[PDB]
Amino acid sequence: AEYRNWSKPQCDITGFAPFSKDNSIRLSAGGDIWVTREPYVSCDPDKCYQFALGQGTTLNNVHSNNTVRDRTPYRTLLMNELGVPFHLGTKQVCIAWSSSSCHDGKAWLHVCITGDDKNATASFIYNGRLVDSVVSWSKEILRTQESECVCINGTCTVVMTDGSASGKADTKILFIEEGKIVHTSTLSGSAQHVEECSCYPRYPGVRCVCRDNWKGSNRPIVDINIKDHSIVSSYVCSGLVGDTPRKNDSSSSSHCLDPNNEEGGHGVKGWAFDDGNDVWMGRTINETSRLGYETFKVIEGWSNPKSKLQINRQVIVDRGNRSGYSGIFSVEGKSCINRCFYVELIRGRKEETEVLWTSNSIVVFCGTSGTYGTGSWPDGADLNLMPI
Amino acid sequence: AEYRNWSKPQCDITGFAPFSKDNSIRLSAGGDIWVTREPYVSCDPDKCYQFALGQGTTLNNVHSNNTVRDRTPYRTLLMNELGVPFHLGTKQVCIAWSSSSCHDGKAWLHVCITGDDKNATASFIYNGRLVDSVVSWSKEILRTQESECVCINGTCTVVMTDGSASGKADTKILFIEEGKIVHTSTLSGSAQHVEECSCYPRYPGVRCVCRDNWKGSNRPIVDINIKDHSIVSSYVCSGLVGDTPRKNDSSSSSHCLDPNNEEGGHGVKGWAFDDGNDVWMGRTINETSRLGYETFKVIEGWSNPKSKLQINRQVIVDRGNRSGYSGIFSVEGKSCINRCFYVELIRGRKEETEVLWTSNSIVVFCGTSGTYGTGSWPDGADLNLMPI
Amino acid sequence: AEYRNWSKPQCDITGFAPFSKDNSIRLSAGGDIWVTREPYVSCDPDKCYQFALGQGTTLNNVHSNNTVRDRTPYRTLLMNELGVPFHLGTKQVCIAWSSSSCHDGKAWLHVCITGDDKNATASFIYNGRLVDSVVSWSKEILRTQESECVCINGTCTVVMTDGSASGKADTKILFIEEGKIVHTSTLSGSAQHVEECSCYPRYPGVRCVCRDNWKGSNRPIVDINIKDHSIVSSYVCSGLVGDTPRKNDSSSSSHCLDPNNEEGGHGVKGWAFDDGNDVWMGRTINETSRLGYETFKVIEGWSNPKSKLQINRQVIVDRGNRSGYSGIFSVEGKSCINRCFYVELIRGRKEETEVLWTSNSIVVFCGTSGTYGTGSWPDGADLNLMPI
Amino acid sequence: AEYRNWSKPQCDITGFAPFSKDNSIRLSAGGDIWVTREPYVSCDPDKCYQFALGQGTTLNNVHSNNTVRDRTPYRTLLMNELGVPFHLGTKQVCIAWSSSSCHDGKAWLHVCITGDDKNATASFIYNGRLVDSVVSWSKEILRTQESECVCINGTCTVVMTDGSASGKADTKILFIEEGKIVHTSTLSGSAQHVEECSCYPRYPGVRCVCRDNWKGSNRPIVDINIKDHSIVSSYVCSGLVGDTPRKNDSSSSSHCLDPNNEEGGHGVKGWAFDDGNDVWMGRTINETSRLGYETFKVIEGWSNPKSKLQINRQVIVDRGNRSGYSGIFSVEGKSCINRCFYVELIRGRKEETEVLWTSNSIVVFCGTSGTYGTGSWPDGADLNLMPI
Numbered sequence A, B, C, D: 001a002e003y004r005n006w007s008k009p010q011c012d013i014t015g016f017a018p019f020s021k022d023n024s025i026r027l028s029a030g031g032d033i034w035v036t037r038e039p040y041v042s043c044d045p046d047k048c049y050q051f052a053l054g055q056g057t058t059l060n061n062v063h064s065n066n067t068v069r070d071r072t073p074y075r076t077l078l079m080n081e082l083g084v085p086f087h088l089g090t091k092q093v094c095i096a097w098s099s100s101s102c103h104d105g106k107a108w109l110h111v112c113i114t115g116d117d118k119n120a121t122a123s124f125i126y127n128g129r130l131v132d133s134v135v136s137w138s139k140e141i142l143r144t145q146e147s148e149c150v151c152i153n154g155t156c157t158v159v160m161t162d163g164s165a166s167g168k169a170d171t172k173i174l175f176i177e178e179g180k181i182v183h184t185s186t187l188s189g190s191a192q193h194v195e196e197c198s199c200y201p202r203y204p205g206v207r208c209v210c211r212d213n214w215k216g217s218n219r220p221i222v223d224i225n226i227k228d229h230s231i232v233s234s235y236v237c238s239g240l241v242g243d244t245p246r247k248n249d250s251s252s253s254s255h256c257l258d259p260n261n262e263e264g265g266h267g268v269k270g271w272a273f274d275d276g277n278d279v280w281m282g283r284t285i286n287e288t289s290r291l292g293y294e295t296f297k298v299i300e301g302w303s304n305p306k307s308k309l310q311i312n313r314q315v316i317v318d319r320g321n322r323s324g325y326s327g328i329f330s331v332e333g334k335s336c337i338n339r340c341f342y343v344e345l346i347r348g349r350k351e352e353t354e355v356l357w358t359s360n361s362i363v364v365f366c367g368t369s370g371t372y373g374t375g376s377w378p379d380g381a382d383l384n385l386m387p388i
């Protein structure tokens, strides 16, 4: 086994093909299935895995009441092969109410954060063992990606944040070799508020598209230089913006360097990637809530903040159906690196009041250089009929 | 690992021996078992796997109501080792309401079709990754085999159909190397309506026996030339015909080149294979519904459309018990290639009204050059007693 | 991987140590566990597996009513690693209401019999594929060991029986190389009625200790010569006899060559093995029913039919607790071949009327050259409290 | 594969980071989960496993009533990968109401004790086979560690005890090569009562920190010389003592050689390890019951029995939440050997009367040379709402 370098060009992408779907909530009406949220996908050189943060309970279980909360001592990172729903033989790979995972070509890293809000601990687990950990630095909800980290030549990078969700926070980028933190660069450049980064290998570096929870409905970009540890940051130029809430398409605007100051408060985790000067990007369909999910290409969307020329739109989840977090993951082909993305389909509280729980299922699409048609792939559980 | 070529002669077959049975519906009265249909078997060089299309629900689950429908966004391709029933730790290998799978000797291909009726997408998954996809070409329920595809020398072939179920449709044969569509030949020859092909390696080519849903109760044959991509087609000569509905044995007739025009409308998926000039073939026992299942040899049945000389009959499922789809799969021995076949045992709606669901179990027999006796191996669930 | 030869001496045995126990019925009061009977153990070169014949249902399942019957089309051979109870992810390795399994050092053989009483089929499955089969020869319940077969140098042997359970039957010994029946020797020597053999490698041959269902409460011995295919047969000399029913210890007698004619009708599957001129043997404690289970050494018990000198008695299951079938299996050590034995703990009908079902759990002991103490290891389920 | 020697220095430890947590009791309110106690962790060269002693029942199961008892014939040693909760596909690796496990680098040893109180049997299982066993020597509850054993150069050592829990007992240390007892040294040195040792490799030997159930609330130390089989023993000097019950911090005292005679009766399993002349140690927070759990360093705590200088305290389970047994396990890094520890979170009878059962979940922390913060990680099940 050799370390992954991802030193191959990015695949031609004409859009996305369906890849995976676990029907987790549907199964949980007649089965023992974990309550989760903040799911994500990452893949060893052979095959893909689905991760999520458990609420240390199954759905049809008294302990699923009030699983709307974000941080309890009972949350663990779940890990299965992709398409195996989180049943009772699912391995909890660490304790975590915030996490990130990646495989360097030899072994799995996990970055798992748990403990007190005001004094959390991040654990660094590599190859079945604990190799390091760091305390919260700013004593305000140390947190990380909720999607895959990225390793080049055996140096893995991950973005973490400590501080305010609605003010200046303290974001850092760690470099990790075999579970050992070998460096920490602090955030730099024009990105003002950075969270839940969706990162992908862009040889020789790593690129991330994050969530601005403060004053931006455009999404921050973070550029990580793996060799000299330098950081740069900015925003996705595209005039059609990827966060939620946001303004409508006719009213929205963006800026390559600053938050747009348009319904900037709050956000949702999401993703984008460059294709020459164009941007591929997913986003919720409904501008203010986590309803529906779409992907498209914005032509000149990576370089031109006035550009609002979308082509190749796809509905992933129709506008009347709930979506949630989404994020990138990268899969190596024979000749190129593909881009795929998962979407968290959230069900339950607070938005749906028919039940007491909050859970999710997932749907997963992958870059394609072939052709594709249309559809919608929602959660499809009936919360009127579920465990009363 | 080397690519499979199947460059070995076909085994002497004197009939079929019992191989596998999952009792899926019986287990589902006291267990968490998936609702499925369109099951099938395919085997890597070591061992066999059972696939089926899930309805994204378990049987004892509110979501099993109305699982009679064919295409929902919740259907996925299920995959276990043969004889492991589809429990909750079953891997969904892709999203699909129509599929085909095969192993080329190195890795698994899956061909998974999902999305809108009038604009479906076929995804091509090889070795744990998405390598290609194609849109529906005729915008009318792009669909495929519901049984194993076939790979020779690392070129896999699969038959797909788009268009009318009861008129001229647009059938194509794809050639796939490592998940990449490297060619598409369109259907040619005398076969007029072609669906749900049951294909097997017949070195140096591939042979398929399909379902004529339009004007034929005799079954179409499709001959696929793997090297030059040429296609030829015709029908199973045998005067005892393999589709259902059909006429009775005294009234039936057939034709080597054309549909017989005898209760041709509709059909059921099924299979046949040549043995010199004789044909081995399975079929439902009841001429008009999916009740019972039998296999026999028709002597001269491959070359002579007037020949109705059966020998070596076996009852697989007795005439008072429900059957369903059936299909071939091919297993490599030390010196020869064996032919085996699975039978879908369908239970529930519309035919059985005691429950609200529609599911299936499977039974699997294999070619034998030894001897065998008799029996019947039905589903054996009591739908009067099941999840009310 | 090389074929097993078992060309090592038998381990010193001073008695038996506890090895495994699955608590199958206890677990099945709060879990999805298979209904089984006729369980057994066999081991690949690395590790041990537990097999049993399923009733194609779980215990807490409507279909468990009337599982007292021996042959239904829903019975399959179950296979797990030893100590994993038969849950829903258990693999059914073939269809079978009678079976035998062994590993030759390279791959697993299974011998699986199913179908009509008066015309059953035995399937021979090797290395994940069907290689052969034979019909019933005497058209009266073709049946086999219900415990492991034995392979030396890649020739596996198995004992099968067709005919009367209470008269002369037709017993044969098959020789199988890679799933292919390469010879059939018919039973010969003084053994008059032979069933459910418990066989073990006794280099250069195989030795078996069977059940006389007709006129003998002493147990038949069958000696299988693997190279020239010759058979010899006789009975376990020991004056303390191993079948059930039997006479009491003060009244019993035996004979090295003939059935003893003492409560000979019926029997239970069981086992014995030679140790110089002494015999190690297990048996039910209660002389007339399947209650309790004991093991001991009878000094001179292998050569002297008048000898009733037991030493080293161990209670495995105390006399007030149900037992059932038992059988040998052989495990290779660094320098010697060990002998271990499993015991079927039967619960339910007809004997226990509190429930409608018939099932079993297992307990497994192994030869030891160290020391040991005492105890009892029954089923331990409360049938008064179980699934009403 | 080579034998483990652990010939690497012990890792710098500044405290402990969170590693694993199974939420076993929480899951068991809506799932089929085993009733356990006496859990523990041990790891093969690749990855970690969680063991526990089952009560041969699941929690939501009639047979969970009265699982407060310590020794029944239904208890087995459970084994999963760490973080997989004990579901129904969990392997029982042997019969046992007392056990110890370790991997020598090639294969697993298990030491499993079961049978009559006054005549128990220890079975020695190596590499999937029974290699040895010993009887109880003093006929009074032969028992062992309830945590991992230790192997150096293919010689594994384990500490066992037979005799009184509240008087002089007969403790021995066995040496085991490939499952074969190759020597037995009897306990020697100043340790007066020794139980449930927590052992770790301290090249070239093994060191253990045990429980004095008789007259000591300080913990015994046992030093095992692997090459010449010599034993020495004494007590943990530290003035803050690790057993429970114990006196408060202001009143407690200790002694390097003798039991302290302070609430010495009874105890709880626990652990400690040297760091120069300082001791790392865990213990319950509440001085008299198994409530809370803390770890700290006592400076000079290994050499100075008057020293009560703790630094680096961590709360693992807060003082209002139940704890239980805890023990060490050792994990090999690139350059050093790490120390990790698990904590049994006991729920149910006798202490909690809301239910009839007694079970546990686990939480697992590992040595870290990085930094960490704070929290509490209790069981988190609501016994008011659980299976009534």
Ligand SMILES: *[C@@H]1O[C@H](CO)[C@@H](O[C@@H]2O[C@H](CO)[C@@H](O[C@@H]3O[C@H](CO[C@H]4O[C@H](CO)[C@@H](O)[C@H](O)[C@@H]4O)[C@@H](O)[C@H](O[C@H]4O[C@H](CO)[C@@H](O)[C@H](O)[C@@H]4O)[C@@H]3O)[C@H](O)[C@H]2NC(C)=O)[C@H](O)[C@H]1NC(C)=O
Pocket: A014, A015, A249, A296, A310, A311, A312, A313, A314, A372, A373, A374, B118, B119
């Ligand atoms: C079968 O499935 C395929 C693949 O999904 C569909 O083909 C896609 O259809 C979508 C939807 O219309 C196309 O996406 C749209 O592209 C528009 C581009 O406008 C034109 O300009 C280019 C010039 O380069 C021309 O080639 C082309 O003819 C276009 O006319 C955008 O304007 C669209 O955005 C606008 O519409 C959407 C709603 O549709 C709004 O929400 C937006 O905010 C905005 O106003 C959109 O991006 C897509 O490009 C097609 N892709 C491909 C690969 O062909 C088929 O439509 C479908 N067939 C059927 C029968 O359903």
Ligand SMILES: *[C@@H]1O[C@H](CO)[C@@H](O[C@@H]2O[C@H](CO)[C@@H](O[C@@H]3O[C@H](CO[C@H]4O[C@H](CO)[C@@H](O)[C@H](O)[C@@H]4O)[C@@H](O)[C@H](O[C@H]4O[C@H](CO)[C@@H](O)[C@H](O)[C@@H]4O)[C@@H]3O)[C@H](O)[C@H]2NC(C)=O)[C@H](O)[C@H]1NC(C)=O
Pocket: B014, B015, B249, B296, B310, B311, B312, B313, B314, B372, B373, B374, C118, C119
């Ligand atoms: C134990 O199990 C074995 C194996 O299953 C059975 O043997 C088979 O029995 C079947 C059923 O009869 C045989 O199949 C039939 O073959 C007939 C051939 O007719 C004769 O011609 C040949 C000349 O080559 C002679 O060798 C032979 O003696 C025959 O007499 C066909 O005519 C049959 O089809 C007709 O009957 C069936 C109903 O049975 C109708 O549904 C058809 O539509 C049609 O009218 C049929 O194909 C089979 O060949 C036997 N196989 C083998 C390998 O021996 C035993 O019968 C069974 N024993 C018991 C006691 O149950």
Ligand SMILES: *[C@@H]1O[C@H](CO)[C@@H](O[C@@H]2O[C@H](CO)[C@@H](O[C@@H]3O[C@H](CO[C@H]4O[C@H](CO)[C@@H](O)[C@H](O)[C@@H]4O)[C@@H](O)[C@H](O[C@H]4O[C@H](CO)[C@@H](O)[C@H](O)[C@@H]4O)[C@@H]3O)[C@H](O)[C@H]2NC(C)=O)[C@H](O)[C@H]1NC(C)=O
Pocket: C014, C015, C249, C296, C310, C311, C312, C313, C314, C372, C373, C374, D118, D119
């Ligand atoms: C701890 O556990 C150990 C191991 O299980 C026990 O030791 C065994 O005890 C049994 C039970 O008594 C012994 O088995 C018996 O052997 C008798 C032999 O008689 C004597 O002859 C030899 C001469 O070679 C002397 O060495 C020896 O002292 C004997 O006195 C048989 O006669 C017994 O059979 C009879 O008794 C049983 C009931 O016990 C009846 O059911 C029979 O039908 C028959 O009448 C029996 O076989 C065994 O050999 C011991 N084994 C070993 C290895 O030591 C301990 O007893 C136990 N300790 C406690 C306190 O429980």
Ligand SMILES: *[C@@H]1O[C@H](CO)[C@@H](O[C@@H]2O[C@H](CO)[C@@H](O[C@@H]3O[C@H](CO[C@H]4O[C@H](CO)[C@@H](O)[C@H](O)[C@@H]4O)[C@@H](O)[C@H](O[C@H]4O[C@H](CO)[C@@H](O)[C@H](O)[C@@H]4O)[C@@H]3O)[C@H](O)[C@H]2NC(C)=O)[C@H](O)[C@H]1NC(C)=O
Pocket: A118, A119, D014, D015, D249, D296, D310, D311, D312, D313, D314, D372, D373, D374
């Ligand atoms: C974020 O999380 C970190 C890591 O958990 C916390 O830092 C630890 O805090 C604990 C709790 O106070 C410290 O442990 C304590 O150490 C004391 C040592 O006293 C002084 O002496 C040294 C000299 O070497 C000085 O460096 C240091 O400044 C100390 O002032 C002990 O006296 C303590 O024991 C006593 O207190 C506890 C209750 O706290 C009692 O139960 C005891 O019985 C006893 O009376 C204790 O051991 C620990 O060392 C810190 N560790 C590290 C690595 O920094 C932060 O507190 C936390 N931050 C927040 C905001 O929560």
Ligand SMILES: *[C@@H]1O[C@H](CO)[C@@H](O[C@@H]2O[C@H](CO)[C@@H](O)[C@H](O)[C@H]2NC(C)=O)[C@H](O)[C@H]1NC(C)=O
Pocket: A065, A066, A356
């Ligand atoms: C589910 O959890 C909610 C939230 O705790 C419960 O409602 C609370 O329960 C407390 C204590 O019984 C009440 O006094 C409060 O009125 C509730 N608090 C809040 C903030 O709403 C509720 O009881 C639970 N429901 C079930 C069915 O278990």
Ligand SMILES: *[C@@H]1O[C@H](CO)[C@@H](O[C@@H]2O[C@H](CO)[C@@H](O)[C@H](O)[C@H]2NC(C)=O)[C@H](O)[C@H]1NC(C)=O
Pocket: B065, B066, B356
């Ligand atoms: C199972 O599904 C059927 C089909 O949808 C349900 O029957 C329909 O329900 C609607 C809305 O309640 C009714 O208005 C219609 O009369 C029914 N439609 C058709 C086409 O039959 C039925 O309610 C479901 N049954 C259960 C027990 O859930």
Ligand SMILES: *[C@@H]1O[C@H](CO)[C@@H](O[C@@H]2O[C@H](CO)[C@@H](O)[C@H](O)[C@H]2NC(C)=O)[C@H](O)[C@H]1NC(C)=O
Pocket: C065, C066, C356
């Ligand atoms: C369990 O199975 C038994 C055996 O079939 C059932 O009893 C029979 O049922 C038939 C048809 O209802 C009756 O007419 C007979 O009197 C019974 N036959 C025999 C031979 O006993 C019984 O109904 C089943 N019990 C349950 C609870 O399902």
Ligand SMILES: *[C@@H]1O[C@H](CO)[C@@H](O[C@@H]2O[C@H](CO)[C@@H](O)[C@H](O)[C@H]2NC(C)=O)[C@H](O)[C@H]1NC(C)=O
Pocket: D065, D066, D356
């Ligand atoms: C749980 O087990 C307890 C302990 O055995 C049961 O209580 C005993 O049951 C016996 C026999 O019925 C009574 O005579 C005694 O009074 C009880 N003995 C003791 C020592 O308490 C109890 O019945 C069981 N409870 C349930 C719900 O099964």
Ligand SMILES: CCC(CC)O[C@@H]1C=C(C(=O)O)C[C@H](N)[C@H]1NC(C)=O
Pocket: A038, A070, A071, A097, A098, A141, A143, A165, A195, A213, A267, A268
């Ligand atoms: C702590 C701020 C952060 C917002 C950027 O909270 C996230 C918001 C969430 C959200 O917007 O859905 C849910 C996430 N589970 C949560 N993470 C944690 C650890 O609380």
Ligand SMILES: CCC(CC)O[C@@H]1C=C(C(=O)O)C[C@H](N)[C@H]1NC(C)=O
Pocket: B038, B070, B071, B097, B098, B141, B143, B165, B195, B213, B267, B268
């Ligand atoms: C779309 C036409 C085709 C008939 C040839 O339908 C098949 C018929 C079926 C049938 O005859 O049972 C059920 C199959 N699930 C269905 N496939 C789909 C995708 O609908």
Ligand SMILES: CCC(CC)O[C@@H]1C=C(C(=O)O)C[C@H](N)[C@H]1NC(C)=O
Pocket: C038, C070, C071, C097, C098, C141, C143, C165, C195, C213, C267, C268
């Ligand atoms: C068919 C005769 C044979 C007795 C030797 O029956 C066995 C007796 C049994 C018994 O004595 O328990 C149960 C076995 N399941 C049964 N096997 C079959 C196939 O019926």
Ligand SMILES: CCC(CC)O[C@@H]1C=C(C(=O)O)C[C@H](N)[C@H]1NC(C)=O
Pocket: D038, D070, D071, D097, D098, D141, D143, D165, D195, D213, D267, D268
């Ligand atoms: C037999 C004495 C020993 C105390 C040192 O008992 C242990 C005490 C226990 C305890 O203090 O919790 C529970 C353990 N399961 C038990 N082990 C056995 C085998 O009984």
Ligand SMILES: *[C@@H]1O[C@H](CO)[C@@H](O)[C@H](O)[C@H]1NC(C)=O
Pocket: A286, A287, A288, A289, A291
């Ligand atoms: C978006 O979401 C909210 C959720 O309740 C809904 O009320 C609103 O109508 C939706 N808006 C649009 C424009 O679809």
Ligand SMILES: *[C@@H]1O[C@H](CO)[C@@H](O)[C@H](O)[C@H]1NC(C)=O
Pocket: B286, B287, B288, B289, B291
């Ligand atoms: C065939 O199937 C139908 C199903 O209801 C049944 O009514 C009919 O009697 C059967 N016909 C024959 C000839 O067996």
Ligand SMILES: *[C@@H]1O[C@H](CO)[C@@H](O)[C@H](O)[C@H]1NC(C)=O
Pocket: C286, C287, C288, C289, C291
């Ligand atoms: C043996 O078994 C039967 C089973 O009911 C019982 O009645 C009888 O008392 C037992 N006999 C002896 C001698 O233990």
Ligand SMILES: *[C@@H]1O[C@H](CO)[C@@H](O)[C@H](O)[C@H]1NC(C)=O
Pocket: D286, D287, D288, D289, D291
């Ligand atoms: C310790 O435990 C007992 C358990 O009931 C409790 O009553 C007591 O208050 C606790 N003591 C302290 C000092 O916390």
